[PDB]
Amino acid sequence: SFKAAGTSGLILKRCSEPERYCLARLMADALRGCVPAFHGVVERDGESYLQLQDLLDGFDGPCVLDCKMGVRTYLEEELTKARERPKLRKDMYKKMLAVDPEAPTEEEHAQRAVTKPRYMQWREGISSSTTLGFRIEGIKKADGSCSTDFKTTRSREQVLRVFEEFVQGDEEVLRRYLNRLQQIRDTLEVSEFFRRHEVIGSSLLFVHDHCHRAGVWLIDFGKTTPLPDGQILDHRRPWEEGNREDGYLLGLDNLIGILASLAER
């Protein structure tokens, strides 16, 4: 999905129409500073790429944690599609049997395949997504080491322990992360973009280094979609099919609470 840009400090991501639309709006929004700078689109090898700020550029050997935000992680239109015209996914079946052999139904076992929405719902439930409104997806280091081994990280305390290990006792990093999340929450709550879009499948990317530099940005607007006609979301109330609620701010509230708790340990 990513390639190296010519210009210093930039990075290319394969263009997608929803994401291009979102980033454009966001540069003119209150949230402008809370997302990677978007510099337009460019062609390479006959294909479109977003020109983005490389969020790692200011850092010396950055540690990175990606947190998928929301209680729901698929669009409502996927549910519609899975009813009328299910696309059976065999890979998604095998993961289930790995985490939980009793998870698939008798019929799923017989099909060796599940619908995407079914797969995404189960993933939300064995992780923290359903209960806390976010989940940890991965950690990268310049230590070189990366991990995506977080599929059953669910309890508030399991999540805390992952962040505890990620910050490695750096009080300044943690204080900065918290300060940045508070300011992001404040921006989200007045953002014109945020009240009028359903924000699904995006992440908060935490970045720090051994010099105590810390930043956090919202990324990945590929599944972020406008609400029709001045309908708005509050981003905290439970999702019920039809209301298009994403629980984004429930997740952000909970994440801030966990980091604040960690800070007081």
Ligand X SMILES: O=P(O)(O)O[C@@H]1[C@H](O)[C@H](O)[C@@H](OP(=O)(O)O)[C@H](OP(=O)(O)O)[C@H]1O
- We find the least distance from the C-beta atom of residue 203 to Mn ion, in angstroms, to be 5
- We find the least distance from the C-beta atom of residue 90 to ligand X, in angstroms, to be 12
- We find the least distance from the C-beta atom of residue 51 to ligand ANP, in angstroms, to be 10
Binding site for Mn ion (CB under 5 A): 220
Which of 133, 201, 247, 251 lies at the binding interface for ligand X (CB under 6 A)? 201
Tell whether residue 222 is a contact of ligand X (CB under 6 A).
yes
Tell whether residue 52 is a contact of ligand ANP (CB under 6 A).
yes
Which of 142, 160, 219, 262 lies at the binding interface for ligand ANP (CB under 6 A)? 219
Q: Give me the 170-199 binding string for ligand X, x by CB under 6 A, dash otherwise.
A: ------------------------------
Alpha carbons 178 and 187: distance in angstroms, whole number: 14
Stretch that binds ligand ANP, among 25-33, 49-57, 93-101, 122-130 (CB under 6 A): 49-57
Per-residue tokens: 86: 């299910």
Q: Choose the one of Mn ion, ligand X, ligand ANP, none that binds residue 1, judging by a C-beta under 5 to 8 angstroms depending on kind.
A: ligand ANP
Residues annotated within a binding site for substrate: 68, 89, 116-123, 223
Q: Choose the one of ligand X, Mn ion, ligand ANP, none that binds residue 52, judging by a C-beta under 5 to 8 angstroms depending on kind.
A: ligand ANP
Alpha carbons 24 and 128: distance in angstroms, whole number: 31
- We find the least distance from the C-beta atom of residue 221 to ligand ANP, in angstroms, to be 8
Q: Footprint of ligand ANP on this chain (CB under 6 A)?
A: 1, 11, 36, 52-56, 64, 66, 140, 203, 205, 219-220, 222
